[PDB]
Amino acid sequence: KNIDGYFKIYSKHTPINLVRDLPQGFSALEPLVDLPIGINITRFQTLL
Amino acid sequence: EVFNATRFASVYAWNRKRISNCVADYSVLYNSASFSTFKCYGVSPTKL
Amino acid sequence: WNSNNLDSKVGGNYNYLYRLFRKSNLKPFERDISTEIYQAGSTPCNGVEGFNCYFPLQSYGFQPTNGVGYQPYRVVVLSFELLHAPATVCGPKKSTN
């Protein structure tokens, strides 16, 4: 997320045994550290 | 008569016409597709 | 604060410009470094300036021989937040009992 230039990272690991059709289970996401840069982001791309 | 007439005047004595108490529509003078140059300074040609 | 010897140059000032005619309004907490030409109706200029192309980035003209209203003024805006994020510029004090 990006609010007032702050970057938020919510990461949480949850074990599951499945390839598709994500189950209806519930799992919260806890943040780790806030990154206050103060810039605008409009595009993103993942690395493989 | 200021646009389509028999003849016009010179530059040392030019025609001075005043428009008062009359509604004017500049939409017809824009889609004529017959003018060579349309220089309209100060105000935008489409927001006047 | 007014600057009489920091930005007051004899040969004018061309490094600082201000937008006057562009249609794109700068929203708060945003920034735009695009240098384009104002488009008035037809003929979109955007850098091919000519027929119906106004220069929006007008020049100031800082000179030491001008009046008080034309001298350059160095303005610094300091913004912050309260009750929004944990304080880190607080300048922490000593730990009491």
Helix, strand, coil shares of chain A as percentages rounded to 5?
A: 0, 20, 80
What are the strands, taking DSSP E only, across B1-48?
A: none
CA distances from C37 to B39, B46, C26, C41 (A): 17, 17, 16, 12
Nearest to C4 by CA among C59, C76, C62: C62
Q: Which residue of B has its CA nearest to C23?
A: B44
Neighbour tally for C90: CB within 10 Å = 7
- Chains touching chain C through at least 3 C-beta pairs below 8 angstroms are A, B
Q: Is A31 on the interface with C (CB under 8 A)?
A: no
Structure tokens at C9: 């140059």
Contacts of C42 (CB under 8 A, 6+ apart): B45, C52
Experimental method: cryo-EM
| Contact predicate A5/C80, CB 8 Å | no
Structure tokens at C64: 């030491």
Q: Which H or E run contains A3?
A: strand A2-3
| Contact predicate B45/B38, CB 8 Å | yes
**Distance of alpha carbon C8 from alpha carbon C71, whole angstroms:** 7
In units of Å, what resolution does this entry have? 6.8
| Contact predicate C49/C37, CB 8 Å | yes
Q: Is C43 on the interface with B (CB under 8 A)?
A: no
Structure tokens at B37: 């140059």
Q: Is A42 on the interface with C (CB under 8 A)?
A: no
DSSP state of A33: -
Amino acid at C87: A
DSSP state of C73: B
List own/partner pairs for C70-75 with CB under 8 A and 24 or more apart. C71/C2, C71/C3, C71/C4, C71/C8, C72/C2, C72/C3, C72/C6, C72/C7, C72/C8, C72/C13, C72/C16, C73/C1, C73/C2, C73/C3, C74/C1, C74/C2, C74/C3, C74/C6, C74/C7
The residues facing C59 across adjacent strands are C17
Q: Residue holding tokens 């824009």?
A: B30
